[PDB]
Amino acid sequence: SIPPEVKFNKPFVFLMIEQNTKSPLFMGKVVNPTQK
Amino acid sequence: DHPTFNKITPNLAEFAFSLYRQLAHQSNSTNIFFSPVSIATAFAMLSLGTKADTHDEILEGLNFNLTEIPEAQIHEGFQELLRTLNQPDSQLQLTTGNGLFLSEGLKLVDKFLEDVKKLYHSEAFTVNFGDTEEAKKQINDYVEKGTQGKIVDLVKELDRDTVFALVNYIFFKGKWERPFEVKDTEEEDFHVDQVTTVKVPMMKRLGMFNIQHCKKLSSWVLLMKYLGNATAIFFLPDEGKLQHLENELTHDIITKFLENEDRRSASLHLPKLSITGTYDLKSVLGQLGITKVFSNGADLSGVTEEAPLKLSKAVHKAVLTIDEKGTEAAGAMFLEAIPM
Ligand SMILES: *[C@@H]1O[C@H](CO)[C@@H](O[C@@H]2O[C@H](CO)[C@@H](O[C@H]3O[C@H](CO[C@H]4O[C@H](CO)[C@@H](O)[C@H](O)[C@@H]4O[C@@H]4O[C@H](CO)[C@@H](O)[C@H](O)[C@H]4NC(C)=O)[C@@H](O)[C@H](O[C@H]4O[C@H](CO)[C@@H](O)[C@H](O)[C@@H]4O)[C@@H]3O)[C@H](O)[C@H]2NC(C)=O)[C@H](O)[C@H]1NC(C)=O
Ligand SMILES: *[C@@H]1O[C@H](CO)[C@@H](O[C@@H]2O[C@H](CO)[C@@H](O)[C@H](O)[C@H]2NC(C)=O)[C@H](O)[C@H]1NC(C)=O
Numbered sequence: 001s002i003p004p005e006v007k008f009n010k011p012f013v014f015l016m017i018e019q020n021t022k023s024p025l026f027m028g029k030v031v032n033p034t035q036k
Numbered sequence: 037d038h039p040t041f042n043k044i045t046p047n048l049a050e051f052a053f054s055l056y057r058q059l060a061h062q063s064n065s066t067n068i069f070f071s072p073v074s075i076a077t078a079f080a081m082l083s084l085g086t087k088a089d090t091h092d093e094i095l096e097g098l099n100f101n102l103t104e105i106p107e108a109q110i111h112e113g114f115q116e117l118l119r120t121l122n123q124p125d126s127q128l129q130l131t132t133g134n135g136l137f138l139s140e141g142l143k144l145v146d147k148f149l150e151d152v153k154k155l156y157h158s159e160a161f162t163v164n165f166g167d168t169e170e171a172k173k174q175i176n177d178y179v180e181k182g183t184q185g186k187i188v189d190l191v192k193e194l195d196r197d198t199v200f201a202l203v204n205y206i207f208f209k210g211k212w213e214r215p216f217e218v219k220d221t222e223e224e225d226f227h228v229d230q231v232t233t234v235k236v237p238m239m240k241r242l243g244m245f246n247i248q249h250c251k252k253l254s255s256w257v258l259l260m261k262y263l264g265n266a267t268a269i270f271f272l273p274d275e276g277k278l279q280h281l282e283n284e285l286t287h288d289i290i291t292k293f294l295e296n297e298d299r300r301s302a303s304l305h306l307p308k309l310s311i312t313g314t315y316d317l318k319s320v321l322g323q324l325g326i327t328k329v330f331s332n333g334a335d336l337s338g339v340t341e342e343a344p345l346k347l348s349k350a351v352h353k354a355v356l357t358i359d360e361k362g363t364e365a366a367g368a369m370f371l372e373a374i375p376m
């Protein structure tokens with residue numbers, strides 16, 4: 001694939017920072033989306 | 037020196053990382069969602085009427101090296117951070133607040149009260165702890181006001197003897213710099229587990245993105261920005277490389293990425309999400325070496341002389357929704373204190 005196809009179809013991590021303060025607003029890990 | 041919060045900022049970060057780490061250790065198989073900032077400020081504005089050993093653990097666990105950093109300065113740092121987050125963004129809403137909810141009998145160490153209003157701009161409320169279903173109410177609302185009705189039932193059971201509670205929220209709503217197209221959003225596979233595949237709506241863009249892959253972190257890393265003063269970073273491990281990633285994470289690394297605005301052409305597939313997480317943090321903060329406030333050794337004599345108090349609950353809840361158009365999340369923390 002051109003471009004490369006990056007698929008977030010496996011459990012990933014993420015976080016939200018605020019730009020200014022560079023503070024870790026929110027941190028997460030999804031393992032199962034349908035786990036509400 | 038100048039805007040001060042970056043004096044505390046990595047201390048926060050490395051906390052988040054580490055608290056996170058515990059939450060991982062607990063169960064490989066759950067969705068994790070918290071908000072570091074929200075958990076932290078509470079234990080910060082709590083520390084401010086704790087004394088001795090018990091104070092020291094809180095701050096400690098938060099990853100502050102008191103030797104290296106004037107405690108007086110820590111609080112300052114925080115005063116700033118809050119301040120700034122709550123600065124009005126034209127495009128993006130981010131709001132947090134802190135409340136103290138007090139049994140109308142309680143005579144407070146006056147200075148504790150000016151401390152929290154000052155430095156943590158906190159709000160105070162005078163309450164009957166003898167109406168548990170009407171107080172519980174009054175609490176739930178503040179938060180459910182606060183997070184615009186994203187969290188409603190933070191307080192599920194409240195103590196009959198409660199002296200006071202420290203409650204603290206965060207609400208965030210931002211829109212992607214370059215949102216996705218909702219047409220293109222097509223229901224594709226997510227492999228949860230090695231045996232479990234679930235179908236998820238996958239939002240798709242092909243375009244010029246901030247992505248790369250660190251041999252370092254054994255992952256791909258994407259940063260997505262918001263219209264505002266904020267950004268999201270998603271870390272897709274390589275295969276088997278998940279705990280690898282989880283460990284190697286550091287604030288440095290985070291700040292490195294953030295300096296890049298170097299784009300790349302790819303095909304990005306990212307699911308549409310709503311998830312929550314609901315935690316009783318005693319235990320996991322137990323791990324992070326904060327234990328004295330939950331026991332019979334606690335010292336909240338900065339709070340009130342009247343009686344020896346202690347913490348009996350610490351409950352975080354956060355919820356997030358990621359869609360094409362952006363994200364909105366929220367988070368809340370609840371601490372309850374009682375006579376021993
Ligand atoms: C948390 O994260 C973990 C990753 O570190 C996840 O762990 C993964 O779990 C699977 C579970 O099957 C592991 O599978 C390997 O082995 C099985 C065969 O052996 C066990 O499991 C089957 C049932 O799944 C049983 O029938 C076997 O008897 C044995 O299980 C034990 O059996 C007892 C009697 O029935 C029973 O009482 C026990 O309760 C039971 N379990 C335990 C823990 O004692 C095999 O089927 C798997 O096959 C896949 O992999 C092969 C190699 O690639 C491949 O050829 C094949 O086609 C399949 O793709 C696999 O060999 C797995 O090793 C382990 N680790 C990883 C790397 O995936 C876990 O899923 C996650 N959640 C939780 C809740 O733990
Ligand atoms: C907080 O302060 C302490 C005391 O200075 C630091 O602990 C020691 O630091 C030296 C130099 O790095 C090490 O050789 C010792 O092994 C440390 N002692 C322990 C028990 O680890 C500590 O490093 C400081 N924290 C930070 C973040 O620098």
Ligand SMILES: *[C@H]1O[C@H](CO)[C@@H](O[C@@H]2O[C@H](CO)[C@@H](O)[C@H](O)[C@H]2NC(C)=O)[C@H](O)[C@H]1NC(C)=O
Pocket residue numbers: 020123124125126127263264265
């Ligand atoms: C995100 O926060 C920044 C702070 O860096 C905001 O920038 C302010 O912009 C106005 C002019 O529009 C200046 O008068 C201020 O001095 C700036 N900084 C502060 C600290 O107030 C910015 O508005 C925010 N929003 C966006 C769109 O980036």
